[PDB]
From Swiss-Prot, chain A:
Subunit structure: Associates with the primase and the helicase to form the helicase-primase complex. Interacts with the origin-binding protein. Interacts with the polymerase catalytic subunit.
Location (main, coarse): host cell
Family, per entry: Belongs to the herpesviridae HEPA family.
Location in the cell: Host nucleus
A single Gene Ontology CC term: host cell nucleus
Annotated organism of origin: Human herpesvirus 1 (strain 17) (HHV-1)
GO BP: any one term: bidirectional double-stranded viral DNA replication
Outcome after substituting residue 30 to T: In strain: Nonneuroinvasive mutant HF10
Full-protein positions shown: 301 to 750 of 750
Function: Component of the helicase/primase complex. Unwinds the DNA at the replication forks and generates single-stranded DNA for both leading and lagging strand synthesis. The primase synthesizes short RNA primers on the lagging strand that the polymerase presumably elongates using dNTPs. The primase-associated factor has no known catalytic activity in the complex and may serve to facilitate the formation of the replisome by directly interacting with the origin-binding protein and the polymerase.
Keywords from the named record: DNA replication, Host nucleus
The protein's name: DNA helicase/primase complex-associated protein
Disulphide-bridged cysteine pairs: none
Length: 450, 505
């Protein structure tokens, strides 16, 4: 296909009649992925991932099942489905510029909620199907959902079968996001009873706080476990009342206990448990090998900056925080110099959807290397001559590469923009607002590269 | 009094550790680039043949990633090739042109003027500098014997001064070309001293001592964390050969080591270092008493030498009329005279991006501010804005005529332009019926835009001229549109802009 695809595969629709499984890299666990490919073949009759979303149901029988599922639900969710606009989030959350702590925070997730909900809604519309024998494709999805916790091979199938099915039937999105909206409503309703407080999340995954004293841990485990029990039971009860029955019994996962939590954007959240120094960062784009180092720098700077809880006037803390953030930026750009010649390290994965640099007329000469490009185009911006910055598709040239010096005055600027969103968010979220952390890259440490 | 604190903005970044040594290797000529080696190893050819050798070099780098290219372009490409660093044990990028695996970048790039003409660019990895400086190399015995005869820095320096094809033209005229990618380690000032009357050498040598004093004061001011004792810090002086028989100008080249742990980065930063070193010796009492009666003007230092692609005649080299030879101004408390004399023969002492001669910390002066508006100019500008009025910039004025798009406004008034051409130059009017406007110059007070459809000169009757529409703000903040033509024939200054008509918009 012109635009490519996420998962490598090679279908054998005819001659010679032997399935051929491409297992990409993963040398350490090669047997694991070989077994996963074999299981994916055996379960979905080998149609996956070639046939697409049609393994479950024809792309055009879905408009009927979705309508047949909007009827068997409860009256409230019937409208809740019809009023779903992209990213409505009708639930009491935190202002995206905000932070919390020290209070006992906790993250929760329902493993595979979209897939399980799709399976239940498919069964609700199953009576509406033309052929009872034409529901065997609706037996593979239940096999996937049932075996999802037992084996991860069903997982990667369900994280792609479901979003692609939602594209096959646009009307299924407004149904799935209405059922999940109903789930979030009962999550919020039950939260108040168990001292839990909805503060953020994205539906199946949600993080919140507890109104317990923030020093006692012996009883903390008890409340953190009772909240999980109550929320799981209440959500299961709402689903049962909505007639939607899940094949694998619902389970809530305690994905971590933390004491401080800071959010800047809608997806960016950093959690940190001071006692065991276990942290988790989300919302930072990992668009290359340098962004991982940037994420590590951010997760260390935030660990050091929330360790400044020493008794001080809020104004003092803002400055002794901004200084440390600038110092972290300094130590990042200093280490950037020692890897200025690693073009693969300063590489960005452009999607076939995003705007892309124009292909040089010599990248069309890679021979048996142009075939590796299926989804991502790895580009590095080098600076030949002067003034002009040109993009090099890294994986379309033989190795070792020879290039003009990498324009770190472009990639580091982008990485620093992301680090700056994270740090403007934390600065304006823990202490008083009004400070946009900017690092004078163009003046302080621009000379190193340009 | 020396000025530096009130008219310079020191911007340094300290880099301690491996980033210090790594930064040094990345921005300075390789350790073996200016270490005397048996023969040359480089790429020396005329501009024409080098365009070909560069084209062929690209055809062995483009296969592996090099962005393809589509006498300034040649110098820019050669400088970029020389700057490119070695990735591990792999041969460097310039090895395609130099044709050896022992080449270590960064490298010096020189310009050679030949007879009758021809700029022959030469990128070298090593060269026979021992041979070039052999003529002015004084043996340790000679310098020691002269020191015994004359125990006096000034006298010994005057006595020690007395005792002194592209591939072959490299050794008659070599001019080092500034590489903005690399870091500058030596303050190299080009002193063009104009002379009313001839100056005796005894006077110049005493003036040069005063210049050393003033420059060292200026250096200890610019680099505050250094330690420049102005009686032992070595400054190197080189005089252009013509007793001085010079009548019009004395050609001088002053080389100063950048004191540790500093390294200067940037063309504009050295432009400041040179302007601070100029005021220091002009405010110095002894220097302007010693050379004043002989110098017509006090403008000694040329500060434009420091720009990517600008070359400076190296010492121990001539001009195609004067071989720059050292003039020894011994430091007043120099503890090693023979070393000082045999320090002028080391190329590192007179190279912009030479290897700095166990680094713990390193301070990179990468900015000494922007263009120097004279305290006289700054105070002149603030006082002119308060008595005469504000002259709005080009961009703001163009914004009034819905331009945020210049090449589109040009099209709308192009009719007025062509109408005035019909009225005053009708014999060439029809060449201006179908014209496309392509930007030529874009400034905050000038916007030149060409009109390619070789058009005809509108002044004389010599296919000889290129047309350029130029927009400026004149009169009462009104837009003045000028048609200008650059012809090639000598009656019209060769390739020089000449205006023909200027109308309002
Ligand atoms: Zn002309």
């Amino acid at each position: 296909e012109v635009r490519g695809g996420p998962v490598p595969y090679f279908a054998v629709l005819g001659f010679p009649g032997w399935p051929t499984f491409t297992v990409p890299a993963t040398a350490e666990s090669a047997r694991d992925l070989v077994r996963g490919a074999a299981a994916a073949y055996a379960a979905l009759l080998g149609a996956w991932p070639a046939v697409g979303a049609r393994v479950v149901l024809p792309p055009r029988a879905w408009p009927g099942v979705a309508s047949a599922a909007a009827g068997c639900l409860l009256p409230a969710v019937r409208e809740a489905v019809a009023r779903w606009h992209p990213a409505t989030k009708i639930i009491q959350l935190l202002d995206p510029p905000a932070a919390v702590g020290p209070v006992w925070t906790a993250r929760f997730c329902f493993p595979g909620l979209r897939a399980q909900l799709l399976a239940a809604l498919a069964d609700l519309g199953g009576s509406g199907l033309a052929d009872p024998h034409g529901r065997t494709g609706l037996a593979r999805l239940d096999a996937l959902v049932v075996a999802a916790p037992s084996e991860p091979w069903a997982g990667a199938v369900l994280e792609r079968l479901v979003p692609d099915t939602c594209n096959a039937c646009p009307a299924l999105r407004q149904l799935l996001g209405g059922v999940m909206a109903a789930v979030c409503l009962q999550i919020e309703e039950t939260a108040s009873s168990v001292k839990f407080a909805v503060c953020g999340g994205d539906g199946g995954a949600f993080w919140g706080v507890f109104n317990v004293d923030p020093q006692d841990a012996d009883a903390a485990s008890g409340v953190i476990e009772d909240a999980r029990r109550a929320i799981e039971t209440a959500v299961g009860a709402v689903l049962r009342a909505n007639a939607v029955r899940l094949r694998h019994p619902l389970c809530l996962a305690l994905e971590g206990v933390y004491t401080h939590a800071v959010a800047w954007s809608q997806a960016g959240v950093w959690f940190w448990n001071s006692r065991d120094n276990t942290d988790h960062l989300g919302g930072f784009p990992l668009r290359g090998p340098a962004y991982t180092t940037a994420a590590g720098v951010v997760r260390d700077t935030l660990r050091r900056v929330l360790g400044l809880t020493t008794a001080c006037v809020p104004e003092e803390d803002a400055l002794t925080a901004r200084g440390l953030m600038e110092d972290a930026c300094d130590r990042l750009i200093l280490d950037a110099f020692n890897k200025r010649l690693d073009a693969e390290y300063w590489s960005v994965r452009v999607s076939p959807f995003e705007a892309s640099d124009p292909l040089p007329p010599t990248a069309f000469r890679g021979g048996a290397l142009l075939d590796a490009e299926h989804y991502w185009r790895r580009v590095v911006r080098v600076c030949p001559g002067g003034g002009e910055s040109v993009g090099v598709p890294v994986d379309l040239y033989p190795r070792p590469l020879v290039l003009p010096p990498v324009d770190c005055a472009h990639h580091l600027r982008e990485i620093l923009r992301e680090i700056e969103l994270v740090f403007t968010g934390v600065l304006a979220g823990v202490w008083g607002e009004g400070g946009k952390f900017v690092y004078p890259f163009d003046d302080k440490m621009s000379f190193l590269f340009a | 009094l020396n000025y530096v604190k009130h008219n310079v903005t020191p911007r340094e970044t300290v880099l301690d550790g491996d980033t210090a040594k790594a930064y040094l290797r990345a921005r300075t000529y390789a350790p073996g680039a200016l270490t005397p080696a048996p023969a040359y190893c480089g790429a020396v050819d005329s501009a024409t043949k080098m365009m070909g050798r560069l084209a062929d070099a690209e055809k062995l780098l483009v296969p592996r990633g090099w962005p393809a290219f589509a006498t300034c372009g040649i110098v820019k490409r050669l400088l970029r090739l020389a700057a490119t660093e070695q990735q591990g044990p792999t041969p460097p990028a310039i090895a395609a042109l130099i044709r050896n695996a022992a080449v270590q970048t960064p490298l010096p790039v020189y310009r050679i003027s030949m007879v009758p003409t021809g700029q022959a660019f030469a990128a070298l990895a090593w060269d026979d500098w021992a041979r070039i400086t052999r003529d002015a190399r004084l043996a340790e015995a000679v310098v020691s014997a002269e020191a015994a005869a004359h125990p006096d820095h000034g006298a010994l320096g005057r006595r020690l001064t007395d005792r002194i094809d592209a591939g072959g033209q490299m050794y008659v005229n070599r001019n080092e070309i500034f590489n903005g990618a690399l870091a500058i380690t030596n303050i190299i000032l080009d002193l063009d001293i104009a002379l009313k009357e001839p100056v005796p050498f005894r006077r110049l040598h005493e003036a040069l001592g005063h210049f050393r004093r003033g420059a060292l004061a200026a250096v200890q001011l610019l680099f505050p964390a250094a330690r420049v004792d102005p009686d032992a810090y070595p400054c190197y002086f080189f005089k252009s050969a013509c007793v001085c028989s010079c009548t019009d100008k004395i050609g001088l080249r002053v080389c100063m080591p950048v004191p540790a742990p500093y390294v200067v980065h940037g063309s504009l930063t050295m432009r400041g270092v040179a302007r601070v070193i100029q005021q220091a010796v002009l405010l110095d009492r002894d220097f302007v008493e010693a050379i004043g009666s002989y110098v017509k003007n006090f403008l000694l230092i040329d500060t434009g030498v420091y720009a990517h692609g600008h070359s400076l005649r190296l010492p121990y080299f001539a001009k195609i009329c004067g071989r720059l030879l050292p003039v020894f101004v011994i430091p007043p408390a120099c503890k090693d005279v023979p070393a000082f004399v045999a320090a002028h023969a080391d190329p590192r002492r007179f190279h912009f991006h030479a290897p700095p001669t166990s680094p713990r910390e390193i301070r990179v002066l990468h900015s000494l501010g922007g263009d120097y508006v004279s305290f006289f100019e700054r105070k002149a500008s603030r006082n002119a804005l308060e008595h005469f009025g504000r002259r709005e910039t080009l961009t703001e004025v163009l914004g009034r005529y819905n331009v945020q798009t210049v090449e589109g406004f040009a099209s709308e008034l192009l009719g007025r332009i062509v109408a005035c051409i019909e009225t005053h130059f009708p014999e060439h009017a029809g060449e201006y019926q179908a014209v496309s406007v392509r930007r030529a110059v874009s400034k905050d007070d000038w916007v030149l835009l060409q009109l390619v459809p070789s058009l005809s000169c509108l002044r004389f009757k010599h296919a000889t001229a290129r047309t350029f529409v130029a927009l400026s703000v004149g009169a009462n903040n009104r837009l003045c549109v000028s048609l200008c033509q650059q012809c090639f024939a000598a009656k019209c200054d060769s390739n020089r802009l000449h205006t023909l008509f200027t109308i309002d918009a």
